[PDB]
Design a protein around this ligand. Structure first.
Ligand SMILES: CC1=C(CCC(=O)O)c2cc3nc(cc4[nH]c(cc5[nH]c(cc1n2)c(C)c5CCC(=O)O)c(CCC(=O)O)c4C)C(CCC(=O)O)=C3C
Ligand SMILES: CC(C)CCC[C@@H](C)[C@H]1CC[C@H]2[C@@H]3CC=C4C[C@@H](OC(=O)CCC(=O)O)CC[C@]4(C)[C@H]3CC[C@]12C
Ligand SMILES: CC(C)CCC[C@@H](C)[C@H]1CC[C@H]2[C@@H]3CC=C4C[C@@H](OC(=O)CCC(=O)O)CC[C@]4(C)[C@H]3CC[C@]12C
Ligand SMILES: CC(C)CCC[C@@H](C)[C@H]1CC[C@H]2[C@@H]3CC=C4C[C@@H](OC(=O)CCC(=O)O)CC[C@]4(C)[C@H]3CC[C@]12C
Ligand SMILES: CC(C)CCC[C@@H](C)[C@H]1CC[C@H]2[C@@H]3CC=C4C[C@@H](OC(=O)CCC(=O)O)CC[C@]4(C)[C@H]3CC[C@]12C
Ligand SMILES: CC(C)CCC[C@@H](C)[C@H]1CC[C@H]2[C@@H]3CC=C4C[C@@H](OC(=O)CCC(=O)O)CC[C@]4(C)[C@H]3CC[C@]12C
Lengths: 575, 571
């Protein structure tokens, strides 16, 4: 009974009560069947016979069969049951997805997505299967066991309660032990299956060397051997399944035989009448064709057990590198940035962070162009709250970044990337993606402010186009102009920027760095680059060898100094 | 094999016995109730009841928790599908290595074997379908109609005639409705995970935008649309099962009321209602699985047509005009005047010109790049020549069979890949005809024995992805071991000599002298020893010969050749 919405409470309650009705008509259908046989044994009036027989046939319509042609009640149960499985499935999928995008960058670098999204989806499938399995299979079939014991031990002869109770115990125990034994065979068949498939696929994939040494004949022979070995073990596993099913049938056979003969004895001794015998025979088979399906669901709870703990592990792994639990906002006015004893160990990088101390001028442009290596992108990520400070003081406008909180940061800050990574979507969403809660007419206004109008008329249908892998393919300058529309919509306090090594054409280049100067106006920027035009518009440059600051000044100061920037400028002057 | 003829004969007979059980178990049930309603002599009653319960054990309910004969047919039928699965799998794999590289290098091996196992599973599922569900359930329908028709009054044959024909007809029309919902479904599943995985990939730009609220709201919107489609899915399936259920109910109701009327009128006996009331459920419950197999038939037949597509086709790059044997005896190497057409590249053959008699080791050199193995792929009959003649030992390669040239040539690539196995089958892999004494004798004779015995397991070491991981020089020496135990008539070589260890490079060159002990080789390399080893050296620029002459002649010519050699050697 989830407390989400009152409609869902009523669907849950009506489906539970409807389950109760099905487990109630489980006993009525045999009881009616016995009454019909008694009406036919000694003669009955047709007028009452017809109504009782029709009443029975509609009750057997309500439950056509056990797990096959389940019947009106079970079918109506399953159709209304999905409308709470949608709720719980949707809720857990949203929660796990929010947690996946909660986790930090360092989690997301190496491990992929489809190897994790499968874990999420199969975990949701596992929990839905667990609740549906349990509530509709464990408690109902155990309830049927209690009703069989109770009803045959009260209203029919007590030793048939004995035969049924013993037969249920013999069946359930035998089923679970041979399911374990079959389980060890399942794993044994699976491990060889991996080997036969692996040898096959690599023997094919090495076609160059198979061709190189005439290896088709021996390759056929060894693949046939792997097939024969897999066959000779699959025979063993399927013989185990055969023995399991056959002894399930043999225990049902002994249980039915004991009851049928004992009932025959009591009916011939006339303590019971023929209807009671027909009831016993039809009630056992009804009681068991669910139950062989119970064993199947107990061997498909094994996969669920592995998925659920894995789902719980992913759900409970949160980096939580730094945050202020009091939700303390940011008080930002100009862009005063502080460097003092800023040291941090960096993983998987040639450069590291080694005691940098050079505050940037607020309102000005202090670029960082220098050596090969992604330490510039590293300090960009570090300033953009992606890695923990080990030792250092970072004070945007005079307050520590560890306690001013991330929502206030990303409201107060806006940073563009170097590779515009875009979806298979429209363009209107990707230009309003800077501020999704901003109106359309102003996002066309900011798009024309970026200059995106030219691609709009280049589109087959303009601002309502489809762009991506499932849409049209734009160019890099177009997409970076979408990105600058994103950031001017996002209204930054401080802009940080990077580019790749690609410039499309001079006509778009002059426009895009004109707009870069426009957005860097009234803003401090610490830009990183490898493009001469995006370096010369910035005045003062910081160059860092291996995490520590080494040169200083402006670009002509570096040229007269003769540093690595001067060598790069000579190399770009004459290639 | 004739034993499998015995297994299939006993399997068809076992199906026949299983059809007999289906009519007999209810006829026995009617007899037990008959003997029960009038007063029963026990000593016939007890034996008839246990005879029935024996027979009901053999049948094992309807289907699901299947009976003795069904499990026996399923068990002993494995021995036949194993045969046809193994045979058609070997047919695929033989004709798929025998298929040319041209389609094969354009395909990835993960999906081709996926299609192969899917096609084989399709063939066995389809044949088990067609002889174990189609003919059986149709046979059971006929026996039900005939039994209730001729052995009873005609109207019950009427009822079950109409009920099976109607049940199957309704199951058809509703299963194509369900199928059109299923395809609209599964394309919307394709959307609903594509946008999920793209969001997870674009996480970084999301984090710069702080757009996680927007992306979870877009996700939950399109998953709500998914939920609506799921609801329509299950409502369709519920209508299918419930309409079936209504047909079951209509047949049972019509029969039960009609039977009750006849047994009140005593044209039918009191057992006969129990006969019909159990028998029509016994017919009905397998037919619930028949819609499952009319839904299997679609996937089955599209994959098995895919199997005939990929199998009965050919690529067959090397045509067999005369398919003759080569008159090779000493090994003249002859490239002359071939204009071979080539696309998606610049490596057409614009009449390269070099030939060597036996007694002349041959070289090749040109620009940078790994495309020089195209010449060797042309050399070992992977692509036929358009216009011109290529000879080996004076014999043109355009008319002989492929296997006549396949054996005689020893080529070592840059990396002969070592399998996930021992080294016994690795030295067996060079050539299989020889014995253990001479393959480990050539293992000592090729200088791999030192590190084989230096490794802590010796000749039986487990090596590869399923074993230990070796080194590049050792596996190159393994390739040299394979070709020196192969003992091919003439050797066309490629050589790594990747300057890792100088001692192993000297072992490589000693192996080179031993494998070229008065026999010719052609070498594609850019290192000093492996270029001065050959008698003459030709420069080829994508099929264009530009300079020929020895190492000192080319270095005295001194152009792009000498500057790339000296810039590679030093800086
Ligand atoms: C009635 C029924 C449901 C619905 C009830 C419920 O869901 O609660 C169900 C669910 C599922 N069945 C599933 C998968 C499979 N079940 C198979 C095989 C079988 N199904 C059977 C019965 C059922 N199974 C049985 C007695 C067999 C053996 C005979 C045969 O082989 O027909 C096969 C092999 C097919 C082949 O070998 O041809 C597969 C791949 C999946 C996973 C997702 C998917 O793959 O759809 C799920 C949730
Ligand atoms: C939350 C869920 C698990 C509740 C499920 C409850 C049902 C499994 C039980 C509860 C009470 C049971 C009923 C209690 C008493 C009877 C009367 C009983 O008939 C008689 O008393 C005599 C019949 C005869 O003469 O043979 C038939 C079964 C029935 C309807 C039972 C059917 C099964 C019921 C509904
Ligand atoms: C919703 C669709 C699937 C139609 C379902 C129809 C049933 C609900 C109807 C059709 C046949 C009807 C039966 C036809 C005949 C009789 C006998 C009748 O008894 C008599 O009057 C005897 C003489 C005679 O019927 O001519 C009592 C009602 C009953 C059981 C009827 C009960 C209601 C039934 C089952
Ligand atoms: C090829 C595959 C599909 C198997 C087909 C089997 C049928 C051709 C046969 C084999 C044994 C037959 C059964 C053998 C004996 C009987 C008893 C017979 O009982 C009688 O009352 C008839 C004789 C009499 O009048 O005394 C009714 C038919 C039945 C069940 C037969 C039904 C048809 C069966 C199943
Ligand atoms: C497959 C393995 C696990 C053994 C299964 C046991 C059956 C083969 C046995 C157990 C119950 C036995 C039955 C128990 C009672 C009787 C009644 C008996 O009738 C009599 O004449 C003796 C009793 C009397 O006097 O009424 C004839 C043998 C029979 C059918 C037996 C036949 C053989 C049965 C079915
Ligand atoms: C959609 C599927 C379920 C087919 C439905 C067919 C029924 C609507 C038909 C087929 C058989 C018909 C019956 C065939 C025979 C009889 C017996 C007949 O009366 C006699 O012949 C009595 C003879 C005697 O006194 O022994 C009256 C009509 C009736 C009930 C028919 C009523 C209409 C029935 C049930």
């Amino acid at each position: 009974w989830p407390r989400g919405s009152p409609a869902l409470q009523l669907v849950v309650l009506i489906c539970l009560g409807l389950m109760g009705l099905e487990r109630a008509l489980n006993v009525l259908v045999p009881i009616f069947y016995r009454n019909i046989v008694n009406l036919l044994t000694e003669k009955a009036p047709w007028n009452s016979l017809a109504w009782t027989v029709t009443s029975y046939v509609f009750l057997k319509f309500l439950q056509g069969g056990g797990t096959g042609s389940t019947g009106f009640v079970s079918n109506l149960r399953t159709f209304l049951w999905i409308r709470v499985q949608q709720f719980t499935s949707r809720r857990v999928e949203l929660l796990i997805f929010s947690h996946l995008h909660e986790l930090s960058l360092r989690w997301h670098l190496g491990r992929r997505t489809g190897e994790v999204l499968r874990i999420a989806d199969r975990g949701t499938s596992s929990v839905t299967g667990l609740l549906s399995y349990l509530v509709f299979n464990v408690i109902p079939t155990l309830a049927d066991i209690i009703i069989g014991i109770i009803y045959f031990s009260m209203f029919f002869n007590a030793w048939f309660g004995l035969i049924v109770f013993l037969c249920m115990s013999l069946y359930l125990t035998l089923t679970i032990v041979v399911t374990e034994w079959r389980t060890k065979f399942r794993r044994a068949m699976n491990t060889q299956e991996n080997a036969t498939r692996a040898r096959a696929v690599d023997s094919l994939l090495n076609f160059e060397t198979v061709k190189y040494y005439n290896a088709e004949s021996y390759e056929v022979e060894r693949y046939r051997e792997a097939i024969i070995k897999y066959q000779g073990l699959e025979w063993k596993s399927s013989a185990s399944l055969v023995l399991l099913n056959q002894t399930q049938n043999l225990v049902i056979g002994l249980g039915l035989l004991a009851g049928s003969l004992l009932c025959a004895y009591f009916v011939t001794e006339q303590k019971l009448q023929v209807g009671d015998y027909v009831l016993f025979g039809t009630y056992i088979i009804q009681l068991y064709m669910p139950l062989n399906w119970f064993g199947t669901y107990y061997r498909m709870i094994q996969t669920n057990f592995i998925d659920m703990e894995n789902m719980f592990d992913l759900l409970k792994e949160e980096t939580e590198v730094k945050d202020l639990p009091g939700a303390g906002p940011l008080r930002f006015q100009k862009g005063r940035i502080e460097f003092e004893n800023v040291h941090f160990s960096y993983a998987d990088g040639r450069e590291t962070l080694q005691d940098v101390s050079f505050t940037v001028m607020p309102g000005q442009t202090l670029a960082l162009v220098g050596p090969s290596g992604a330490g510039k992108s590293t300090i960009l990520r570090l300033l953009f709250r992606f890695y923990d400070i080990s030792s250092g003081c970072i004070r945007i406008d005079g307050q520590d970044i560890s306690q001013v909180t991330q929502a206030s940061l990303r409201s107060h800050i806006g940073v563009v990337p170097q590779d515009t990574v875009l979806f298979n979507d429209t363009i209107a969403d990707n230009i309003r993606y800077g501020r999704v809660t901003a109106g359309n007419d102003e996002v066309e206004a900011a798009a024309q402010a970026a200059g995106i109008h030219d691609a709009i008329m280049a589109f087959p249908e303009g601002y309502r186009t489809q762009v991506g892998e499932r849409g049209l393919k734009l160019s890099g300058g177009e997409k970076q102009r979408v990105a600058i529309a994103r950031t001017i919509l996002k209204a930054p306090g401080i802009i940080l920027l990077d580019e790749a090594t690609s410039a499309l054409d001079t006509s778009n280049e002059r426009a895009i760095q004109a707009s870069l100067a426009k957005v860097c106006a009234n803003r401090t920027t610490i830009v990183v680059a490898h493009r001469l035009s995006t370096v010369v518009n910035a005045d003062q440059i910081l160059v860092i060898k291996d995490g520590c600051i080494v040169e200083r000044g402006r670009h002509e100061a570096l040229l007269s100094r003769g540093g690595v920037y001067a060598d790069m400028w000579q190399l770009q002057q004459g290639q």
